[PDB]
Design a protein around this nucleic acid. Structure first.
Ligand SMILES: [Mg+2]
Ligand SMILES: [Mg+2]
Ligand SMILES: [Mg+2]
Ligand SMILES: [Mg+2]
Ligand SMILES: [Mg+2]
Ligand SMILES: [Mg+2]
Ligand SMILES: [Mg+2]
Ligand SMILES: [Mg+2]
Ligand SMILES: [Mg+2]
Ligand SMILES: [Mg+2]
Ligand SMILES: [Mg+2]
Ligand SMILES: [Mg+2]
Ligand SMILES: [Mg+2]
Ligand SMILES: [Mg+2]
Lengths: 294, 52, 159, 169
RNA sequence: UUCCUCGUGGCCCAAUGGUCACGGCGUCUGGCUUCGAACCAGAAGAUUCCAGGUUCAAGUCCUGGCGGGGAAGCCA
RNA sequence: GGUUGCGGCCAUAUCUACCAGAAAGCACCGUUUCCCGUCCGAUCAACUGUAGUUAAGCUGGUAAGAGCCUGACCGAGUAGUGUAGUGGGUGACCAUACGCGAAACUCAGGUGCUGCAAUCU
RNA sequence: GAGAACAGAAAUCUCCAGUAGAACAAAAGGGUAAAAGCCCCCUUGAUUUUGAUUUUCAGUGUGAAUACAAACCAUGAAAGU
RNA sequence: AAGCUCGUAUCAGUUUUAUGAGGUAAAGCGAAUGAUUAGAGGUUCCGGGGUCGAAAUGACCUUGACCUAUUCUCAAACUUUAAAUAUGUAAGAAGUCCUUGUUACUUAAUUGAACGUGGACAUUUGAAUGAAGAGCUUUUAGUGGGCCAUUUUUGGUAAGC
């Protein structure tokens, strides 16, 4: 009835490319990101892409070619258990840790790890990775936040701060970090440092612990089940950071199976196409029955 | 909008004399102004007494 | 009065396409242009900045300058009884590599291959291209292909 | 089947279409905040009609959005004003419904003479959970055919809950 | 043919883009008179000659049509 | 082979109506102290992954489906057009010689391919 | 298109469809959908120094426009503009 | 006209190969815009109406819209598609490949960019045909009312307009 579009409309319709149809890429942003100064002929532009799905965080370094994009290194949230983090795999601190991980991962595989050590005595101060004198002018990369909404205190910038302390040079102002005083234009390092170490979580423990117990039970259940205390939350993060700076080399999984076996089961499981000869028989039978007086 | 124009000085014209006669009982005096080459005077009268 | 603007008589020449409106695909910005590349010009109507004048549509020239967002091109223009070279500055959206060269230097490297290989045993490599030669003799059998006799068709109205 | 496709209220929209701005406009706005606990918003007119006596952007009407248990509370408090009976045509074809009332004083604010007397227009937007698929920014999509509300579903839900009835048709 | 002008209450006309719009005569009700006038209190009535575009609003701003009136038409 | 992140070509990829989806992923989904934003924690912000569900999103399949794409001595060597004649015709126009060559229409076939990295009974 | 008191063909609000059939100071034509359209926040690059180039062209001028360099700035978290 | 530098070339009113651009001819309107003849089926909580009706979100007809599927004909300032003829560029020595030198530019980086050293590849050195010599400079006369023919085409009924 009303749910009908004319042939002329369907024949004159323009479709978005593919990604604008799926609503995943801002091509208006991609323009400004991947475009390279034409006098710098083949010098690629590397992007720090950060995405935030449920229960996981993704960080990658991507350059672009005509045939497709190419990635240097990637760092996911779910590998933190290797480095001593088991819960809150998407919190602000988890983001900062991931940014640190990918930072050391890249500089390690690029040979820029001994130089440009980064920042170790983290204090929530706003400082950039300055170039060492007569040195290799540290690596440069830009954020690619995608469709994610920019806002003060957003956890996407936690990855930025993770990389910047990790040793990468990421150009940025500080007026979007959490703790940025608004009516007067300054930053609060104490609050920023607290966020870097989960301060807003360890602090949030105390109220629920002193006000409502079943609420303290259903969420943070893993904390009780594994005996982690509010005060102990900073320590595990600090112990982690050293592990990342010790070995970011991205040990992969073992997969306990093969590519072929996975293919075999999916191949046998998925519905297949129907051949033209069968389709013709099917319609012929449909005439034979429905039109054939049943 | 504004409270200005201590200008035109109320032309001596007999139509203006009738305007002044009909003024003191009120009814929403409308007046027109002509300001060619700066030198300006009030030429025409009109009434719009609704206030509703 | 008469009217000769900068974009006069460009009503159809700058219409974009059918079902190809919207933004430009990134491959254009991913292209790399060197000095000395020979390149055609086709104005994109969606990018008003750095457009070429309508006369240069469909022309081909040589790159002589590269800047952050544009490319300097040399075009030969016939005026009067001679040619004058004109120097342009065009954003990459009105720019695409002329594949004529891309095809050409494949020949150059192919001839290099044949020349060296044939030089290894001296058999007169014979690099030059030749036009379509008149076809040489051949024999045609009728086996299972007995010739068919045709005849003119009479007139019928067919309406 | 029916695992988790239960029907719930998104929002209640309360509208008062004052034909002009000014003091009466302010007095009308002064009503809603006691009923809601929210700050109301006053909507402008989009073109002149010159017979209703409105200019463009003359800021004629007021409306408020209320959601959650507060919303269903106000909805219940209005249904008693309608004595739990609504005529059929009031129910939208997409599963929403609404009705108008007079004399907002029939609930809450006794009279409070500085305000005066005003009527309202309660309206309800109705669907199933998981509807943010059409509201999020990333991967925006449309809801499936079988998962949409309808006249038949909304009527039956309005009977089974609030144990009310529908009029002639 | 051109150019110009005009068309608005029953009649003659006036009109500030910002109120269905103004005057005078005319019409209606009541009063005075034996009665009609004159006179005294009060009212009402207009698709601004036909269609579009602009404006937020168009009698008005303008473009397209109908009817009326005026001027021009000379050197041979 | 499935899934996710970033893509390239930009409908064979869109649209309508139904059906199916192990595992993982994605998703919906729970809460409001903190950073943050709204009439409204609906979007956006933050926390948990715990309380649940494949209903939806998404993927795939089905339709003498719309559309889209490719092809054919189907239409058609037709329409049109470059060069020549002391060619025809009163004329409008039309054939011939050497060349190029459509669109509509009909029929047949198809209904995304692919790069990098990560994960999956 | 379907619904809500006064409210009706035209007042405000909600849902569904909606390739632009609207809007972008003006005449007309191109161009534009997470925008070039609507709303909001901050600003003055509508700045300084002369050069090169395109149109009209004699390859003169004027008008208009394009791409840089050397400074000082605006905006955005950033690439950028 | 005066010549000058050189001696078969840094050529050409030409064709071929390769590769670009165009919106005319044609064609189309059951494809966007506009025009336009005709019937058919629905839809009126909703046009004008009439009949049964007091009316109904009742029924039956008729005329106009509205929608759906069809039908006849059109566009210099309409269009999906789209010729023929004309038109841009390339077919090497000012070239190709290998190695490493300069830079205050650029790169995360001797990474790139541009310009070079040295080494290797010649008359089949990279399609056809011709080349009557090729290139370059100065100075000055006359001219700046045109007309005719084929083809395309504007105003006009038309014209030796
Ligand atoms: Mg943006
Ligand atoms: Mg074109
Ligand atoms: Mg009387
Ligand atoms: Mg924007
Ligand atoms: Mg000039
Ligand atoms: Mg043309
Ligand atoms: Mg034609
Ligand atoms: Mg056609
Ligand atoms: Mg048409
Ligand atoms: Mg050609
Ligand atoms: Mg002389
Ligand atoms: Mg001369
Ligand atoms: Mg002269
Ligand atoms: Mg003369």
């Amino acid at each position: 009835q009303k749910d009908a579009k004319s042939s002329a409309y369907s024949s004159r319709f323009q479709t978005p490319f593919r990604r604008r149809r799926e609503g995943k890429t801002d091509y208006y942003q991609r323009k400004r990101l991947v475009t390279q100064h034409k006098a710098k002929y083949n010098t690629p532009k590397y992007r720090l892409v950060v995405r935030f799905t449920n229960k996981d965080i993704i960080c990658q370094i991507i350059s672009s070619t005509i045939t497709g994009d190419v990635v240097l290194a990637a760092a996911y949230s779910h590998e933190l258990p290797r480095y001593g983090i088991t819960h809150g795999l998407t919190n602000w601190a988890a983001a900062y840790a991931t940014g640190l991980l990918i930072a050391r991962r890249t500089l390690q595989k690029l040979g820029l790890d001994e130089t440009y050590k980064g920042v170790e005595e983290v204090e929530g101060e706003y400082e950039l990775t300055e170039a060492v004198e007569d040195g290799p002018r540290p690596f440069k990369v830009f954020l690619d936040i995608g469709l994610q909404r920019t806002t003060t205190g957003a956890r996407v910038f936690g990855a930025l701060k993770g990389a910047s302390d990790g040793g990468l040079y990421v150009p940025h102002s500080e007026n979007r970090f959490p703790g940025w005083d608004f009516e007067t234009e300054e930053i609060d390092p104490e609050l920023l440092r607290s966020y870097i170490f989960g301060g807003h979580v360890s602090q949030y423990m105390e109220e629920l612990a002193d006000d409502d117990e079943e609420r303290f039970s259903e969420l943070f259940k893993g904390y009780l089940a594994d005996d982690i205390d509010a005060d102990s939350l900073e320590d595990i993060y600090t112990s982690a950071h050293e592990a990342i700076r010790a070995d970011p080399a991205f040990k992969p999984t073992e997969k306990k199976f093969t590519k072929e076996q996975y293919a075999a089961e999916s191949k046998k499981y998925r519905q297949t196409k129907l051949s033209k000869e069968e389709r013709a028989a099917r319609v012929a039978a449909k005439i034979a029955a429905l039109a054939g007086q049943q | 909008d504004g409270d200005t124009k201590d200008d035109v000085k109320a032309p001596e014209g007999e139509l203006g004399d009738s305007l002044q006669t009909a003024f003191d009982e009120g009814k929403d005096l409308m007046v027109t102004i002509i300001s060619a080459m700066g030198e300006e005077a009030a030429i025409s009268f009109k009434e719009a007494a609704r206030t509703d | 009065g008469k009217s000769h603007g900068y974009r006069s008589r460009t009503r159809y020449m700058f219409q974009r396409d059918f079902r190809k409106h919207g933004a430009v695909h990134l491959s254009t910005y991913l292209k790399v242009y060197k000095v000395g590349d020979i390149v055609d010009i086709k104005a994109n109507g969606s990018i008003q900045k750095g457009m070429p004048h309508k006369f240069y549509q469909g022309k081909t020239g040589v790159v002589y300058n590269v800047t952050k967002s544009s490319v300097g091109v040399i075009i030969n223009k016939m005026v009067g009884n001679r040619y004058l070279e004109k120097r342009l500055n065009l954003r990459v959206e009105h720019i695409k590599h002329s594949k004529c060269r891309q095809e050409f230097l494949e020949r150059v490297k192919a001839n290099a291959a044949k020349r060296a290989e044939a030089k290894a045993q001296g058999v007169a490599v014979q690099l030059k291209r030749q036009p379509a030669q008149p076809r040489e003799s051949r024999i045609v059998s009728t086996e299972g292909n007995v010739p068919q006799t045709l005849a003119p068709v009479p007139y019928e109205t067919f309406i | 089947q029916n695992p988790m496709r239960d029907l719930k209220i998104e929002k209640l929209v309360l509208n008062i279409s004052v034909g002009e701005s000014g003091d009466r406009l302010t007095r009308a706005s002064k009503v809603l905040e006691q009923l809601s606990g929210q700050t109301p918003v006053q909507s402008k007119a989009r073109y002149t009609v010159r017979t209703f006596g409105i200019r463009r952007n003359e800021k004629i009407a007021v409306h408020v959005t209320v959601r959650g248990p507060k919303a269903e509370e106000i909805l219940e408090r209005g249904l008693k004003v309608k004595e739990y009976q609504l005529r059929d045509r009031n129910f939208s074809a997409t599963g929403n419904f609404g009705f108008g009332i007079d004399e907002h004083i029939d609930l809450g604010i006794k009279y409070d003479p500085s305000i005066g007397i005003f009527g309202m227009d309660f309206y309800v937007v109705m669907n199933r959970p998981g509807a943010r698929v059409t509201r999020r920014k990333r991967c925006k999509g449309t809801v499936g055919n079988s998962h949409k509300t309808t006249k038949e579903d909304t009527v039956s839900w309005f009977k089974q809950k609030y144990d009310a009835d529908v009029l002639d048709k």
